[PDB]
Amino acid sequence: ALLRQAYSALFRRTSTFALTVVLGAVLFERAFDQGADAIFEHLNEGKLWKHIKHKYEAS
Amino acid sequence: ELVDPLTTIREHCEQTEKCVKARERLELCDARVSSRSHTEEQCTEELFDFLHARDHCVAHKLFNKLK
Amino acid sequence: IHFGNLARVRHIITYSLSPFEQRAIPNIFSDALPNVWRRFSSQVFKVAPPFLGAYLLYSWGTQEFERLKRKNPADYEN
Amino acid sequence: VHNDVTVPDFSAYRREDVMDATTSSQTSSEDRKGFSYLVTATACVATAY
Amino acid sequence: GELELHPPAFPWSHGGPLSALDHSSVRRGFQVYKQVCSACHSMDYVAFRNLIGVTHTEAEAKALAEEVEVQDGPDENGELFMRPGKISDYFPKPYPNPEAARAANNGALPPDLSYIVNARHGGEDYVFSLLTGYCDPPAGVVVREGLHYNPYFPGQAIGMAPPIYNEILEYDDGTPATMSQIAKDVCTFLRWAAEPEHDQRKRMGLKMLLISALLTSLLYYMKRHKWSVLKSRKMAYRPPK
Amino acid sequence: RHRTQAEINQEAEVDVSKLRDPQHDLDRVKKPEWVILVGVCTHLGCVPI
Amino acid sequence: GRLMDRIRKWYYNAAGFNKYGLMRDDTLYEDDDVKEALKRLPEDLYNERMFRIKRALDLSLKHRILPKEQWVKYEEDKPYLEPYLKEVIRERLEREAWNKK
Amino acid sequence: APNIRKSHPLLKMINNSLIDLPAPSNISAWWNFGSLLAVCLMTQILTGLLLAMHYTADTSLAFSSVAHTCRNVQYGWLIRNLHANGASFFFICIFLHIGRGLYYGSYLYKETWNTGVILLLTLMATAFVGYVLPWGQMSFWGATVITNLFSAIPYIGHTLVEWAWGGFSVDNPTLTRFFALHFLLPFAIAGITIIHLTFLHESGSNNPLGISSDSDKIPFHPYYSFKDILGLTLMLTPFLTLALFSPNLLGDPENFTPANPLVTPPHIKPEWYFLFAYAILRSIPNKLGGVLALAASVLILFLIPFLHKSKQRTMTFRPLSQTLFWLLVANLLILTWIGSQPVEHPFIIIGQMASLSYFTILLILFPTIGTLENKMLNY
Amino acid sequence: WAWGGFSVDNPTLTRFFALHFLLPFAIAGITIIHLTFLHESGSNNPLGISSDSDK
Amino acid sequence: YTADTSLAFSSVAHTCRNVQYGWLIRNLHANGASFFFICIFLHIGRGLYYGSYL
Ligand code: HEC
Ligand code: HEM
Ligand code: HEM
Ligand code: HEM
Ligand SMILES: C[C@@]1(c2ccc(Oc3ccccc3)cc2)OC(=O)N(Nc2ccccc2)C1=O
Ligand SMILES: CCCCCCCCO[C@@H]1O[C@H](CO)[C@@H](O)[C@H](O)[C@H]1O
Ligand SMILES: CCCCCCCCO[C@@H]1O[C@H](CO)[C@@H](O)[C@H](O)[C@H]1O
Ligand code: FES
């Protein structure tokens, strides 16, 4: 009954619906960025400065 | 010593039918143009047909051997 | 402000359901796609033709231009 | 006369849970709305992002 | 007359829509620019700081900059003086003005290379083909003195003598310095020099595609949802009769 | 431009009455081997090669 | 020879307004002359035209057409407005001619 | 009044144009480009301001200030891509908007149409002066070709050109004034858009069937607000895909080279959205004649409403016109293609053909076929 | 942020020009709103009493 | 005008010194700003005095 539970607690009152969108965005962003960055770096393993750096890092 | 894969591959590609035929037509042009003393002709076209076929071939293999 | 003075209408009944009582994209296979095909079909021989022709004129004109760049062996025979 | 008027049949369109005329439609209302609003709330999140 | 040979398409590791640049290759390419091309080619739009976190570390970048002497001033006497480079400095110009440049290249002007791959049809494919494609003129074609035959250059007679050959330098990373290897690297470097944002642009594009797929779907539903009212709507004409 | 003596002749040989801008090659110069012009195409302004 | 009938029947079918249940007259652009004529139509003919049009717009929005059995047939198409419209234009021309006179 | 949405003098306006506005129930995707054009306008202005805040209108600094923007300004490169490509998106949408208009006879709304043409003309001038700003080789020479078009006008021609230039050739005063014009014009476009929509509301929208929709209207919200937002995201994908994965697909590499007054590029070719017109300009081997053909190629749009002979508004039920319509569209593709090629056989002849047929379809075939179709309906 | 740097400098100048170019038009637009609200009632007058009897 | 610290001051000078009537246009703009404030102040004054603010 998630759809049902979600409706009552989150989607019914316009106020709660707004808070749900705010937190939802906050959560979504954190996850979407990380996943997106991961997918990108994975498709480019060994080509980024992130990958090469260790060779010349010598601080 | 040291060998540029570009040389290797270019020689291999020149063995190709298309290159061989193009090469052939070029040598023929070169020969006749070089033998005359009053002709406007030039062998750019045949050279291009050749270079075009050879290099197209090179493109596919060359980077496989480069770092 | 136009609603209310648009047209003189009589004896027409209409029935509708809340958007929550129905499906958003119903009968995709039994109705949607069959109609997309209908629509496509009824227009392809109206649209496609001139574009096909444009494509040809393009192919020709392009090939002809490049053909005229080639050497004419009959210019150096003698 | 209006007595001879009846609402057509919308079975080719009704959501599965309100297809049966002898079942309360209220029991599936929250789900039917929860879902539609979920889409909307999600679109709002993607948009805010 | 207008006979031209167009370069083939090489499978650069940065050609794919989600393909970043090979930074090892960009680092090397830089050395080629620094040790070979910069002798006659300027790169006005890139500074030593641009290297940091891309191809070099900050320490390295600073070193590279200090290797150069730059003019500054005026000082207290209103005199111009020399000083060692700072990472905020842009790459040194080989000449004070194009006049001097031409003067040192037989009237020919070596172009700035900051945007060269974008200023030429074919981009790196063209720069690569030109660098490795020198050869003797075909029968019936004579190159005037000072120029060199290159089928890839328009007109085919370029004022640039073949800039690179095997082992013309030594990659400090041990990569076999072959002519084509060198061209391939410097070309990669040139791509970066022209669009430093290359990588970030592609990472954004990825997200753009995902968010777009998602959002387009949700909006499609919502439009369908609201319009269902009219789409399934029925009507009849019941005149009194 | 410095015109060879060969050139200066071919310009003396031009049907003027059959030209767009009816002008004799000696109405444009003060010294035959020296022709000075403003290299801008009188059409839409490009520079003539 | 009956060449028109051949052509006019082909066109009618090619046009396709009959797929929406519309008569030829239902599709006329409502300029001044047409607007006037419409006001002269008898109640029923008017209400009928309205339903056909509303119905067609509903079809147009739905992106459907009527089942082939409901398409109007070339020879059953009713030129319900043409007579009115002609009178309307005639009258107009009369006024026009007269106002120059 | 009981509810503010109607009494308030400002909301009243929003309500009557975007909430309670009566809209035909059956308008298609072809009616989505009006709002898309509006969004391009808002988008272009917003990105233009952001770019203008780092731009420098001076021949010695133009090119590099743009370079400075793309290389140093946070997301400067992104903002520039969005602006440059947005201009294309703007033309794609304006052309489809126009097509829809001609097809559905939306031009029978004469004032909405006419201002529509003014909007097009203004957008063209905007794009032109804007394109010149980066000051590359293409910016410079295009500016040279275009401005010299006006020199074709008899008597006052040379005088007008030198005036517009602020000197004897395209130079710094041309650049600085072009920047100002480029900054100003977009706002005239915004203003005239209001006039456009004002005339339009006098009658509300037309619809695909070309028959009165008074019997079936619906509130703009949420029907078309939702449909419009959907259309926005659909067109937004290609736009972003292009801008983010192929930033330079549409531009001439020649514009990555600082303008050189002494060297004209070998193949001067205009942006894609001007090709078909360029083609027409070249069809007539006579300076003035070619200019008139070009002028007429666009001003011909003011004539459309008077070449309507059909007794029906749209082409929906006019199969012969529909063919004639797609011929015209294809004719435009051919012109576009011809405009990107050099002036040489077979292009020259193909070009003059397409040019000649372009005007023939609009000035003769369309009114003629419309009359012919009327008779086949027995009218 | 407003400065675009650590002090009033070139990026301040170029952004100020753009603002200066833009704002006058916001002034023009808001003027329309000004006169729009005004016409809801028309002008007031020196005696501060209704002038409906003498317009 | 030219918005760049190295050219601002002189572009204005160029305007007043070289542009036909440039000096006049600059005076009208500079002084117009003042007339603008004189008028806005009196407009406000009138407003406060006559209760236009209601
Ligand atoms: C001795 C000076 C010199 C060196 C070293 C040199 N160049 Fe050049 N380069 C030139 C000159 C001179 C031209 C001008 C050619 C012309 O226009 O005739 C030129 C032109 C070019 C062009 C293309 C010009 C065009 O019109 O397409 C490119 C690209 C280029 N060089 C790349 C390189 C790269 C990369 C390197 C280093 C690997 C390099 N050059 C090294 C002298 C040099
Ligand atoms: C800056 C450019 C323009 C903008 C922002 C714009 C905007 C709009 C808007 C929002 C609409 C309503 C929705 C729609 O039907 O698309 C519209 C309708 C219309 N516009 Fe434009 N327009 C522009 C250019 C033009 C052009 C170039 C023409 C004609 C040459 C034109 C002709 C019309 C007409 C006739 C309609 C009527 C639509 C109908 O048939 O109902 N518009 N426009
Ligand atoms: C109708 C909307 C607009 C259109 C069609 C448009 C179009 C263009 C075009 C064609 C370019 C050249 C892009 C390139 O570099 O290749 C350009 C440049 C520019 N535009 Fe706009 N523009 C619009 C609105 C604006 C506005 C409102 C401003 C500023 C307030 C503006 C400021 C600029 C600036 C500063 C540039 C130079 C930087 C650059 O070239 O990227 N534009 N514009
Ligand atoms: C760009 C600035 C402004 C412009 C162009 C402007 C323009 C106008 C116009 C044309 C009128 C009608 C004629 C008149 O009574 O003077 C008016 C009236 C008025 N304005 Fe402004 N105004 C401006 C600024 C202001 C300011 C700063 C205030 C108040 C802080 C203001 C308050 C009013 C009011 C209340 C009236 C009512 C006059 C009456 O008592 O009948 N205006 N304004
Ligand atoms: C973007 C562009 C452009 C935009 C709109 C145009 O439409 C016109 C605007 C004003 C006057 C005439 C046409 C023309 C060119 O501006 C510009 O310099 N170019 N480039 C160009 C190149 C060669 C010849 C002619 C032009 C454009 O395409
Ligand atoms: C005080 C807060 C400081 C935050 C520093 C912001 C640094 C922005 O870092 C950004 O990260 C992106 C993802 O890796 C890269 O693609 C961008 O090029 C880079 O500039
Ligand atoms: C409908 C299209 C929505 C576009 C949303 C994509 C958001 C772009 O995301 C961007 O990615 C960059 C690369 O990691 C980051 O450096 C930026 O800070 C971030 O905003
Ligand atoms: S041929 Fe047209 S500008 Fe020279």
Short mmCIF file of C-alpha atoms in Angstrom, two decimals, chain H residues 20-164:
data_model
loop_
_atom_site.label_atom_id
_atom_site.label_comp_id
_atom_site.label_asym_id
_atom_site.label_seq_id
_atom_site.Cartn_x
_atom_site.Cartn_y
_atom_site.Cartn_z
CA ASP H 20 -9.42 30.94 -19.13
CA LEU H 21 -8.43 31.67 -22.71
CA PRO H 22 -10.77 29.73 -25.03
CA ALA H 23 -8.78 27.40 -27.25
CA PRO H 24 -9.88 25.02 -29.99
CA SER H 25 -10.06 21.46 -28.63
CA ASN H 26 -8.37 19.99 -31.73
CA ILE H 27 -5.20 22.01 -32.42
CA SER H 28 -2.19 19.80 -33.09
CA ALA H 29 1.54 19.84 -32.47
CA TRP H 30 1.79 22.46 -35.20
CA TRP H 31 0.25 24.92 -32.77
CA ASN H 32 3.05 24.34 -30.24
CA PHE H 33 5.65 26.49 -32.01
CA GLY H 34 4.08 29.74 -30.90
CA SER H 35 4.93 29.06 -27.28
CA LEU H 36 8.26 27.54 -28.24
CA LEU H 37 9.13 30.73 -30.11
CA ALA H 38 8.20 32.69 -27.00
CA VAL H 39 10.52 30.56 -24.89
CA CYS H 40 13.39 30.94 -27.38
CA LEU H 41 12.95 34.65 -27.05
CA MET H 42 13.09 34.55 -23.27
CA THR H 43 15.94 32.09 -23.43
CA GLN H 44 17.97 34.05 -25.97
CA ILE H 45 17.57 37.32 -24.03
CA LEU H 46 18.62 35.70 -20.79
CA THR H 47 21.71 34.04 -22.29
CA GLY H 48 22.50 37.12 -24.33
CA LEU H 49 22.58 39.35 -21.23
CA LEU H 50 24.85 36.86 -19.49
CA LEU H 51 27.19 36.90 -22.49
CA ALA H 52 27.01 40.66 -22.89
CA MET H 53 28.35 40.96 -19.35
CA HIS H 54 31.74 39.70 -20.52
CA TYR H 55 31.70 40.86 -24.10
CA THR H 56 33.73 43.82 -25.38
CA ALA H 57 32.68 45.57 -28.57
CA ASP H 58 35.98 46.65 -30.10
CA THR H 59 37.69 45.05 -33.07
CA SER H 60 40.87 44.58 -31.07
CA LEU H 61 39.03 42.85 -28.20
CA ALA H 62 35.85 41.26 -29.59
CA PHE H 63 37.24 37.88 -30.63
CA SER H 64 39.26 37.45 -27.47
CA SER H 65 36.51 38.64 -25.11
CA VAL H 66 34.41 35.81 -26.47
CA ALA H 67 37.41 33.51 -26.04
CA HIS H 68 37.77 34.90 -22.51
CA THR H 69 34.11 34.14 -21.90
CA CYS H 70 34.31 30.48 -23.08
CA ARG H 71 37.65 29.85 -21.39
CA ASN H 72 37.46 31.78 -18.08
CA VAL H 73 33.86 32.55 -17.17
CA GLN H 74 32.22 29.89 -15.03
CA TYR H 75 29.99 28.01 -17.50
CA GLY H 76 30.81 30.69 -20.00
CA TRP H 77 31.31 28.10 -22.73
CA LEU H 78 27.96 26.55 -21.89
CA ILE H 79 26.14 29.85 -22.00
CA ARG H 80 27.72 30.62 -25.32
CA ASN H 81 26.69 27.28 -26.79
CA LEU H 82 23.16 27.76 -25.58
CA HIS H 83 23.04 31.22 -27.16
CA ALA H 84 24.59 30.25 -30.50
CA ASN H 85 22.46 27.14 -30.89
CA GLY H 86 19.39 28.79 -29.44
CA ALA H 87 19.48 31.07 -32.47
CA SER H 88 19.16 28.00 -34.71
CA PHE H 89 16.40 26.52 -32.57
CA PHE H 90 14.70 29.90 -33.00
CA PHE H 91 14.82 29.62 -36.79
CA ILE H 92 13.79 25.99 -36.86
CA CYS H 93 10.72 26.92 -34.83
CA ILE H 94 9.95 30.05 -36.81
CA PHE H 95 10.05 28.10 -40.11
CA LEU H 96 7.74 25.37 -38.82
CA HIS H 97 5.43 28.07 -37.33
CA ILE H 98 5.30 29.67 -40.77
CA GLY H 99 4.72 26.34 -42.52
CA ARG H 100 1.82 25.58 -40.21
CA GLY H 101 0.44 29.01 -41.00
CA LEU H 102 0.52 28.56 -44.77
CA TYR H 103 -0.82 25.03 -44.63
CA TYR H 104 -3.75 25.78 -42.34
CA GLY H 105 -4.43 29.18 -43.84
CA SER H 106 -3.74 30.86 -40.52
CA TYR H 107 -2.78 33.84 -42.66
CA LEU H 108 -6.45 34.62 -43.08
CA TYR H 109 -5.90 36.36 -39.74
CA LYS H 110 -4.22 39.19 -41.63
CA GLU H 111 -2.98 41.30 -38.71
CA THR H 112 -1.65 38.36 -36.80
CA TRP H 113 0.04 37.26 -39.99
CA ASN H 114 1.49 40.63 -41.01
CA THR H 115 3.00 41.29 -37.58
CA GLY H 116 4.16 37.71 -37.86
CA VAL H 117 6.19 38.73 -40.90
CA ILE H 118 7.52 41.83 -39.06
CA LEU H 119 8.65 39.49 -36.32
CA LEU H 120 10.51 37.36 -38.87
CA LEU H 121 12.23 40.35 -40.44
CA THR H 122 13.25 41.63 -37.00
CA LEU H 123 14.55 38.21 -35.94
CA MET H 124 16.64 38.16 -39.13
CA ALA H 125 18.23 41.54 -38.45
CA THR H 126 18.88 40.42 -34.88
CA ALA H 127 20.61 37.21 -35.93
CA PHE H 128 22.67 39.10 -38.46
CA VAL H 129 24.06 41.83 -36.18
CA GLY H 130 24.54 39.26 -33.45
CA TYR H 131 26.48 36.92 -35.72
CA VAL H 132 28.94 39.69 -36.54
CA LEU H 133 29.95 40.30 -32.89
CA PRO H 134 32.49 37.48 -32.31
CA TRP H 135 34.38 39.11 -35.18
CA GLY H 136 35.75 35.99 -36.87
CA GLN H 137 36.45 35.67 -40.58
CA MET H 138 32.90 34.63 -41.30
CA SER H 139 31.45 37.33 -39.04
CA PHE H 140 33.47 39.92 -40.91
CA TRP H 141 32.89 38.88 -44.47
CA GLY H 142 29.26 37.98 -43.99
CA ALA H 143 28.87 41.46 -42.56
CA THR H 144 30.61 42.73 -45.70
CA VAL H 145 28.44 40.81 -48.16
CA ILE H 146 25.18 41.60 -46.37
CA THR H 147 25.80 45.29 -45.86
CA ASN H 148 26.95 45.66 -49.45
CA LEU H 149 23.60 44.29 -50.57
CA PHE H 150 22.14 47.72 -49.82
CA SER H 151 24.63 49.40 -52.11
CA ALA H 152 22.55 47.88 -54.93
CA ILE H 153 19.80 50.42 -54.28
CA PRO H 154 20.07 53.07 -57.00
CA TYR H 155 21.31 56.58 -56.17
CA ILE H 156 21.14 56.41 -52.36
CA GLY H 157 22.84 53.00 -52.23
CA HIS H 158 26.50 53.89 -51.70
CA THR H 159 25.44 56.69 -49.37
CA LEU H 160 23.35 54.39 -47.15
CA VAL H 161 26.02 51.75 -46.87
CA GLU H 162 28.78 54.11 -45.83
CA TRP H 163 26.34 55.65 -43.38
CA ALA H 164 25.39 52.31 -41.85
#
